[PDB]
């Protein structure tokens, strides 16, 4: 069942950039040593990406909250997470996120990741309770507090039971098909996603074929809801976080290496120099 | 750094025409409107 959250407080949302971040292979083909121009929904270069701290910390003393508001889903969402303790555990997608219409549930658990398509009855604050230090010994005990009732489980997929890290995710809902692109990368001392270049490969195509307009996030309740403990209930005082981006129709010029891996690309509609590069079909322009 | 040139247009409609970002050295020539270069 679902339990309430006690301390809420507030903190103004922060911003950061996503310079050359969030590029995925458009089609499933092989190229080599050839730059090619495509046209698909991408994250624009140098974009204002919203920032949420997994623990909405009012003070490092122990005053905490969860920063999990419902957010729009407009022609795609760029999702990534840097963390050190697997706080993020899944997401819910839909339009009203109620039992009236079908919704998609995809949640990672301490045993296995679960994918369901049912008419769940979502509460205001769905979460995953964690009892890492709640019991006498130090061991991982989870808790399921996402929804109340589930109906019409049209689709079901489950997995077998089983130093900050970035985990980029790209979601796209077209032609009744849901697309997931991911990538793993080790990292360190990065309050915000660092700069560089990486390619997101497809993970699974999946034929839900329903209407998604809004979405939210599933977090790990490291504390309890009645009385967690001494203080500092959240881990590392909100160091765990995630960011949200919005893809827009653009036109890109991907460059493939000899091994067929995408190495660099430009945004044709950012600055006149890039427009020239796209027109001349090259990465270098003479006087 | 690059400079853009619009062909044969008065430097009055160029704002409402990569943002122009207001008037910053909008030097006008017979060829057209020249942006981003000093005379």
């Amino acid at each position, epitope marked *: 069942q679902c339990v309430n959250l006690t301390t809420r407080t507030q903190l103004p949302p922060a911003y950061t950039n996503s310079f050359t971040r969030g590029v995925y292979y458009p089609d499933k083909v092989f190229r080599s040593s050839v730059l090619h121009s495509t046209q698909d929904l991408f994250l624009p270069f140098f974009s*204002n990406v919203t920032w949420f701290h997994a623990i909405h910390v009012s003070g490092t003393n122990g005053t905490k909250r969860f920063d999990n508001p419902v957010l729009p889903f407009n022609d795609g969402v760029y999702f990534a997470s840097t963390e050190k303790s697997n706080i993020i555990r899944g997401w819910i997608f839909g339009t009203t996120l109620d039992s009236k219409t079908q919704s998609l549930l995809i949640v990672n658990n301490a045993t296995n990741v679960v994918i369901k398509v049912c008419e769940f009855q979502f509460c205001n604050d769905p979460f995953l309770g964690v009892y890492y230090h709640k019991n006498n010994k130090s061991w991982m005990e989870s808790e399921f507090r996402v929804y109340s009732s589930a109906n019409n489980c049209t689709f079901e997929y489950v997995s077998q039971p089983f130093f900050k890290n970035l985990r980029e995710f790209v979601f796209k809902n077209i032609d009744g098909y849901f697309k997931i692109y991911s990538k793993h990368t080790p990292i360190n001392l990065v309050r915000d996603l660092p700069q560089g270049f990486s390619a997101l490969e497809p993970l699974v195509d999946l034929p839900i074929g329903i209407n998604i307009t809004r979405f939210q996030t599933l977090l790990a309740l490291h504390r309890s809801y009645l009385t967690p403990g001494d203080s500092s209930s959240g881990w590392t005082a909100g160091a765990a976080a995630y960011y949200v981006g919005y893809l827009q129709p653009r036109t890109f010029l991907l460059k493939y290496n000899e091994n067929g891996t995408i190495t660099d690309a430009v945004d044709c509609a950012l*600055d006149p*120099l890039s427009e020239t590069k796209c027109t001349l079909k090259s990465f270098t322009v003479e006087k | 750094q690059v400079a853009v040139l619009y062909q044969g247009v008065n430097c009055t409609e160029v704002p409402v025409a990569r943002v122009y970002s207001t008037g*910053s*050295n909008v030097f006008q020539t017979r060829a057209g409107c020249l*942006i981003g270069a000093e005379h």
Partner: nanobody
Framework: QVQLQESGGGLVQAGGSLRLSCAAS????????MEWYHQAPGKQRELVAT???????NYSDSVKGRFIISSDNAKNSVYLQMNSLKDEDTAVYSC????????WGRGTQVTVSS
């Protein structure tokens, strides 16, 4: 609209505290470079502090230890706090930005009383 406006100038005695604040309408983040220029009367313009997009920060030799340049990502602007003011710090300060074409601002004439 002035794409980059500067504020904070005025008169002040030596050794005081001051915070130059110039704000730009455009995102301070895709601009890729913030810098501050002040020119002494009878002297050429000189650079004060530069902050690139990545986050690297540099200060002039007569700037280290006292002047720190910062930029809060809540209201798009760049901040520059002055302290331990000395009389040759009196100049006309201007903050410079360059996304793909030079931009400039006006005002902020600081005077150090000694």
């Amino acid at each position: 609209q002035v794409q980059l406006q500067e504020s904070g100038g005025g008169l002040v005695q030596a050794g005081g505290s001051l915070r130059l604040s110039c704000a730009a309408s455009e995102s301070i983040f895709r601009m890729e470079l913030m810098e501050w220029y002040h020119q002494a009367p009878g002297k050429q313009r000189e650079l004060v502090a530069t902050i690139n997009r990545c986050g690297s920060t540099n200060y002039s030799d007569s700037v280290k230890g006292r002047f720190i340049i910062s930029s809060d990502n809540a209201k798009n602007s760049v901040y520059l706090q002055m302290n331990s003011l000395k009389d040759e710090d009196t100049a006309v300060y201007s903050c410079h930005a360059r996304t793909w074409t030079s931009y400039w601002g006006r005002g902020t004439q600081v005077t150090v009383s000694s």
